[PDB]
Design a protein around this ligand. Structure first.
Ligand SMILES: [Zn+2]
Ligand SMILES: [Zn+2]
Ligand SMILES: [Zn+2]
Length: 178
């Protein structure tokens, strides 16, 4: 197995996947690495299994159909994996914890949002459809773009949104378009 966390790329107290060489800090894996379970399979492996069981799940889908899906166990897992893929980028640090807003010429957003809040919301089964999860994720980046206006720091929101959107299209097998 790897000797660094797949998510944050640091060593430490690591839990090793039994079916692939990845390793994880306890609270870097989503969901948090389970207490017992021998063997244990990581989220990457669990997602691969879904695909392998239903090859047709990789045919193209419309975004509007995906968003309306209820959060049954497979869709719960897919959103946990998509959230984890965002944390995998180091620029997620900017969006992880609760933001505050005090900048001359700007007003903070009406509905602040951050990654750890989405993480808690998934853990607590607060989303009933994929749409709820995707709306809160996109809100993170939209709040950032609006607040930072023409400061070059706005780009960090474009960058992490692009990681989110690419991973959304991959995980949920969104139909490719030009
Ligand atoms: Zn880690
Ligand atoms: Zn694995
Ligand atoms: Zn099938």
């Amino acid at each position: 197995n790897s000797n660094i966390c797949e998510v944050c790329n640091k060593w430490g107290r690591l839990f090793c996947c039994d079916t692939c060489p990845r390793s994880f800090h306890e609270h870097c894996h989503i969901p948090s690495v389970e207490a017992n379970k021998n063997p244990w399979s990581c989220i990457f492996c669990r997602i691969k299994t879904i695909q392998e069981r239903c090859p047709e799940s990789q045919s193209g889908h419309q975004e509007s159909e995906v968003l309306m899906r209820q959060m049954l166990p497979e869709e719960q897992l897919k959103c946990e994996f998509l959230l984890l893929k965002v944390y995998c980028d180091s620029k997620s640090c900017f969006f992880a914890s609760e933001p505050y807003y005090n900048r001359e010429g700007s007003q903070g957003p009406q509905k602040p949002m951050w990654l750890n809040k989405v993480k808690t919301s998934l853990n607590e089964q607060m989303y009933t459809r994929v749409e709820g999860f995707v709306q809160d994720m996109r809100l993170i980046f939209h709040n950032h773009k609006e607040f930072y206006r023409e400061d070059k720091f706005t780009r960090l929101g474009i960058q992490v949104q692009d990681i989110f959107e690419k991973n959304f299209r991959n995980i949920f097998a969104i139909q490719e378009t030009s």
